[PDB]
């Protein structure tokens, strides 16, 4: 499997290179983020994540913010053409471990362009109770509110621990081609994280992977349902 | 099966309600077009088709033109919410019968919006030799030029008769929902039709259908690979 991800990491796992505080990170083929940034978490408040990449600039960048408050950013120099395959699926992923949190997605948009001019764009603001244009993996599901719940949440509303789930867009994305001048993509998603216990965990991610990607075994909690190993 | 289609009909089949000349038509659940318009065919010249629908206006409209020349239009009043299911696949289809024609697609774009604001948009200008975001049916394939050939064409370049093929977009489209204020879609495609023989046949169509749609049996030639019967 080949994962490129932007992680909202709500729980620090110092035992695997994680900084000892909530952070946003850029993950290339490994949970140990190539670049992290301090995440000013606001549990209970709706947040927005924006992700951008351009094949000429070769800089993968992400920003996190809450309405009427300071934002935080992270960037990493990388040629994803030498990392990812030509065809990929894009998705959201989330996990809980010992510590719980709701991982609610209120909206999710993605745009990709490939000049050789081929484009794909999708935007979800309400998720149907049966999203045929989404591949739901793990414990991911959509509630009556039209929200996408990535991890387990009881009928009451409180999150469950040791949960893992993901949502992929159904159509593969031609992320780059050998006969391409420039390829670019932008993604955004709005999230709501609520936690009853003290420390929230584990986090939410946006990820690009090979088409046949699925939740690898033992990828719960700290590994955000993307990687089978910490290495 | 449930078909809504815009047909570029290059060969008149009067024996099934067809007007006795090349025409553009709007087809609702039947090859016998609810509305047709005179098509000023120009074989060998690249043409463009544009299709539009809005759930408030309830008027499905289509236009055909060639560069630097007069265009032709057709429209039909219809509530597609009462015709189509909520989830559909969009595709292109083409056939040949006794008389042949190349059915080349140079570009294909589609946009759909569903306010309840969910959107899907895709645009193809070059078709990969292995389009994983397309479902190719019948004899449909992509050539080295990056063009989408819907019907059989020999290694030389001349078209074959009794051919049928279609290309669907991989992801289903939430075309309408019960909790929707307005739904709309726009589609466009650029085509090249060349024919060695006298009269070209049979035509090209853009169609919206149920997700599990496939080429029905005995839908060759006049039926444009959409319908199993003329009724
Ligand atoms: O050393 C390996 C490669 O590094 C550079 O290309 C890049 C790989 N990732 C990048 C990220 C940003 C930029 Br700007 C460049 Cl220019 C690169 C260039 O120096 C290449 O010539 C070189 O093959
Ligand atoms: O008679 C059946 C229906 O026809 C109209 O609705 C439409 C069905 N297809 C259309 C196409 C265009 C327009 Br404009 C309308 Cl207003 C419609 C309305 O008159 C409806 O009240 C009625 O139930
Ligand atoms: Ca962590
Ligand atoms: Ca005909
Ligand atoms: Mn981390
Ligand atoms: Mn006709």
């Amino acid at each position: 499997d080949t994962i490129v991800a932007v992680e909202l990491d709500s729980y620090p796992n110092t035992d695997i290179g994680d900084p000892n505080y909530p952070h946003i990170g850029i993950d290339i083929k490994s949970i140990r983020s190539k670049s992290t940034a301090r995440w000013n978490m606001q549990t209970g408040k709706v947040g927005t994540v924006g992700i951008s990449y351009n094949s000429v600039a070769k800089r993968l960048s992400a920003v996190v913010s809450y309405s009427g408050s300071s934002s935080t950013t992270v960037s990493y120099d990388v040629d994803l053409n030498n990392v990812l395959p030509e065809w990929v699926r894009v998705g959201l992923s989330a996990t809980t471990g010992l510590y719980k949190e709701t991982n609610t997605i209120l909206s999710w948009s993605f745009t990709s362009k490939l000049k050789t001019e081929n484009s794909l764009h999708f935007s979800f603001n309400k998720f149907s109770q049966n999203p045929k244009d989404l591949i739901l993996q793990g414990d991911a599901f959509t509630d009556s509110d039209g929200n996408l719940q990535l991890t387990k949440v009881s009928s009451s509303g409180d999150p469950q621990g040791n949960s893992v789930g993901r949502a992929l867009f159904y159509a593969p994305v031609h992320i780059w081609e050998k006969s391409a001048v420039v390829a670019s993509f932008d993604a955004t998603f709005t999230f709501l994280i609520k936690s009853p216990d003290r420390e929230p965990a584990d986090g939410i991610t946006f990820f690009i992977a090979n088409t046949d990607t699925s939740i690898p075994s033992g990828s719960g909690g700290r590994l955000l349902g993307l990687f089978p190993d910490a290495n």
Side-chain angles (χ1 to χ4, degrees), chain A:
Chain A
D1 217 279
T2 307
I3 304 299
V4 171
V6 174
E7 60 158 50
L8 283 177
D9 200 340
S10 60
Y11 182 80
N13 301 89
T14 58
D15 49 29
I16 55 168
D18 227 28
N20 52 19
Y21 50 88
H23 54 283
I24 174 158
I26 295 169
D27 304 335
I28 310 302
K29 307 170 69 66
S30 178
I31 184 63
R32 194 183 297 263
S33 307
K34 297 301 187 302
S35 184
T36 60
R38 211 171 190 273
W39 179 20
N40 306 316
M41 260 211 304
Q42 299 187 22
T43 63
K45 301 290 151 57
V46 177
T48 306
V49 182
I51 308 94
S52 184
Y53 177 81
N54 176 283
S55 62
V56 182
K58 300 186 180 69
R59 191 161 185 83
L60 177 60
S61 67
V63 57
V64 188
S65 72
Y66 302 87
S67 298
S69 184
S70 60
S71 65
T72 64
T73 64
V74 64
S75 296
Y76 187 66
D77 292 317
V78 57
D79 196 336
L80 297 179
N81 307 1
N82 309 333
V83 179
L84 294 164
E86 293 190 7
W87 290 93
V88 296
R89 273 200 171 92
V90 297
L92 300 175
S93 77
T95 60
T96 59
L98 184 62
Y99 297 102
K100 328 177 195 294
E101 85 186 12
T102 66
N103 292 122
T104 314
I105 307 299
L106 307 180
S107 71
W108 180 28
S109 70
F110 176 87
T111 309
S112 61
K113 297 193 180 301
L114 179 65
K115 294 184 186 291
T116 173
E117 169 62 302
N118 287 22
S119 69
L120 173 68
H121 171 70
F122 67 77
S123 189
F124 296 98
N125 289 270
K126 203 208 76 148
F127 299 89
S128 176
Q129 271 202 310
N130 185 256
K132 299 200 174 193
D133 55 352
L134 291 178
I135 301 173
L136 301 180
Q137 299 177 333
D139 310 329
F141 73 96
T142 63
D143 57 21
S144 57
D145 296 328
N147 290 331
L148 171 63
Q149 304 290 355
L150 290 170
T151 48
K152 283 188 173 181
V153 182
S154 64
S155 49
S156 164
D158 71 317
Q160 301 300 321
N162 294 90
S163 174
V164 51
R166 323 195 308 187
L168 318 184
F169 183 60
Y170 196 77
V173 190
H174 205 179
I175 204 74
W176 72 264
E177 187 185 19
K178 295 179 290 184
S179 176
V181 179
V182 52
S184 64
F185 71 81
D186 298 88
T188 72
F189 71 89
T190 303
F191 65 93
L192 180 56
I193 294 175
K194 310 182 296 195
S195 179
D197 53 25
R198 187 174 103 90
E199 303 285 11
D202 276 84
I204 302 176
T205 84
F206 163 86
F207 70 102
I208 310 175
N210 44 325
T211 58
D212 53 40
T213 181
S214 59
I215 305 173
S217 303
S219 61
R222 64 192 193 178
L223 303 185
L224 301 167
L226 296 183
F227 313 99
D229 310 286
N231 303 344

